[PDB]
Amino acid sequence: NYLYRLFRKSKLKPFERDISTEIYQAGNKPCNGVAGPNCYSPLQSYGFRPTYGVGHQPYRVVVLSFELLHAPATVCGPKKSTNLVKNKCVNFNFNGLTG
């Protein structure tokens, strides 16, 4: 159930996806959409098995891409509650207001 694209006419641009299953035409003759000699289906199967070597075992990859745009940034890291001390002279940072 895990597949990869082995054959494509042109290289992918960054952050592009191709879902086409069209038969890859490597030869002058038209494929006609039926698999035939010199015509290979692009999507091949990753036949994962438990006894494979470490190079070939399945690995799950998550890629995190961060982008900044002219719009205000709304994804930021956690804000520390810290603690509240009263009746003493303490430097205060309340919602970005300092003193």
Binding site: L6, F7, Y24, A26, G27, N38, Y40, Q44
Partner: peptide, 13 residues
């Protein structure tokens, strides 16, 4: 040569 290269690539997998 290109046809042979694609054929070998399909064959190896």
């Amino acid at each position: 040569e290109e046809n042979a290269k694609t054929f070998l690539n399909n064959f190896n997998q």
